[PDB]
Design a binder for this molecule. Structure first.
Ligand code: NAG
Ligand code: NAG
Lengths: 50, 50
């Protein structure tokens, strides 16, 4: 699972077999780190009109 | 069922009869109107190509 974002800690409780989180419209919202099994929240890198 | 349009009513008409209200009721009707959408802009290069 490739992407680009601000990774953070999170309070989300994935089930022990689950690896990725998705929001309502397919967009990835979290991942389990595969070495230390914490759930990282994913948020996109900041962008906007100038 | 075949729907009914409402109560059928022969208005009590004749060439010399008038009906006049002896009392009234103040009514407060509520009318609701949309005025504005949520404003959106899309970076179409970021949407198409990520
Ligand atoms: C990977 O190795 C580290 C060594 O500190 C350990 O803490 C962790 O639990 C290990 N994870 C797996 C999936 O074996
Ligand atoms: C007019 O209608 C209201 C509501 O039914 C009633 O309280 C009031 O007494 C009536 N007044 C007359 C003059 O009939």
């Amino acid at each position: 699972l490739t992407g680009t974002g601000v990774l953070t800690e999170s309070n989300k409780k994935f089930l022990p077999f689950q690896q990725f989180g998705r929001d309502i419209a397919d967009t990835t919202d979290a991942v389990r780190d595969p070495q230390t099994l914490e759930i990282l929240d994913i948020t996109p890198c900041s962008f906007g009109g100038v | 069922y075949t729907m009914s349009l409402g109560v059928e009513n022969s208005v009590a008409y004749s060439n010399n009869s008038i009906a006049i209200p002896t009392n009234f009721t103040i009514s407060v009707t509520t009318e609701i109107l949309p005025v504005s959408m949520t404003k959106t802009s899309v970076d179409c290069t970021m949407y198409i190509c990520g």
